[PDB]
Design a protein around this nucleic acid. Sequence first.
RNA 1: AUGGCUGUCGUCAGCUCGUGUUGUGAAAUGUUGGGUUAAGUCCCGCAACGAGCGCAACCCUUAUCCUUUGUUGCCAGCGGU
Length: 225
Amino acid sequence: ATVSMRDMLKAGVHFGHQTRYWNPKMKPFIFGARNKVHIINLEKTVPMFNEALAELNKIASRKGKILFVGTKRAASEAVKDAALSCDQFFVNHRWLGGMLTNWKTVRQSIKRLKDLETQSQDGTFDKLTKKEALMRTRELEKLENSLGGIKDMGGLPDALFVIDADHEHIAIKEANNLGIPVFAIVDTNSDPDGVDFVIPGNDDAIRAVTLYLGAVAATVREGRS
RNA sequence: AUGGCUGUCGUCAGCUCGUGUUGUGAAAUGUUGGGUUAAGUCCCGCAACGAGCGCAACCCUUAUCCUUUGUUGCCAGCGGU
């Protein structure tokens, strides 16, 4: 399973940001400029998207763990259902500095969630004071919407998928410290030197990111099968 | 030379740690920021994530009612003074 050339063109994958934000480390990923904004050379993209997709299908068959990362509301929910298809792990709201490097801390932050999840089922809040019931409930929405998508990780992922290494450069700096391959969809204004398998393109369009993770959800099903 | 015990800034609201992270390093980060509160009190944000001593609470007393008991306490409903 792979993506075609013109199907991504209808989504606007070539459309980048203004030339007032571009990063000079991507000159080999630039086609030209139209209306003072950059245009991404997609003929370079498709092959560079497939050497990554061929590598991603390798670790999916070995039953490794991947991680989708997206912290922008214009794509924050498309990454959720994408992770629901290939039942892998994801973080769609806020990347806490320490999901990988400080995993020894967030692991006990996990047990804070589980017992609170199960006692929210046996009827413990009908036994508690309404103020403590207000306390244990308000924190439940905060934790489930922060690390709820990585609640069944069981350790460290064998891979990690990123969206825009410019806004999420906190994640790419951590992933390199543990020795984990990084697959990012670096926009034209980001520095892709911290990514192993770089993929030029746009993401500020909801229809654009649906092409990506959907295809990533496909390759994982090829692997787990 | 000390222990134990006390005053004191101050009943002011602060003081630190583990891990991660930034810096050659002293250290920084968290503990800053937007509001708010008696209060690093609480929420959101955030390379920080949690934790501890404190803060508050749990304690005593006082302000209201109910239940239980009625002496040497007390005096309404009834008699003798």
